[PDB]
């Protein structure tokens, strides 16, 4: 989506400058929310 947006903006204003690819790292979610995600996975193994 980000690549599509950038290319759509550029195509007319600055023709000829092509955006081949875009990459992103995984976001840094807050600590409190991250702890719950770990708890969820702890329950998936407590079942085993």
């Amino acid at each position: 989506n980000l690549k599509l947006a950038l290319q759509q903006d550029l195509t007319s204003m600055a023709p000829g400058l092509v955006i081949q690819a875009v990459r992103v790292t995984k976001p840094n979610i807050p600590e409190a929310i991250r702890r719950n995600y770990e708890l969820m996975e702890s329950e998936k193994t407590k079942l085993l």
Partner: protein, 109 residues
């Protein structure tokens, strides 16, 4: 890093790639991407491809079940782009170590 669909992060310690390019494509490869084509074409996309693969699988599937297929999926993902963009360079093989899991999950196992 690899963020599984369960919302937990597992860090794969080492992802190795073994590649090779046919001699006749050397001129074009170095013209297009210089001599750093390895870093430009493989080892910068590795982390994004791994994250994309992990986001659709749970901790169990990546850590245990689909570990037999992590390498094949990553190799196919890399080769799909390389074939179209930089012909000649091929990924002969890929290799991945077992991901590290949080202490709490490791203890339960």
């Amino acid at each position: 890093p690899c963020g599984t669909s369960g919302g937990v992060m597992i860090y794969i310690d080492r992802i190795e790639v073994v590649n090779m390019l046919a001699p006749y494509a050397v001129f074009d490869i170095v013209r297009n991407y210089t001599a750093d084509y390895d870093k430009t074409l493989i080892f910068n996309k590795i982390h994004h491809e791994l994250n994309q693969f992990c986001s659709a699988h749970t901790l169990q599937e990546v850590y245990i079940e689909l570990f037999d297929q992590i390498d094949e999926n990553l190799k196919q993902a890399l080769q799909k782009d390389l074939n179209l963009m930089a012909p000649g360079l091929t990924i002969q093989a890929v290799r991945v170590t077992k991901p590290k899991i949080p202490e709490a999950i490791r203890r339960n196992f």
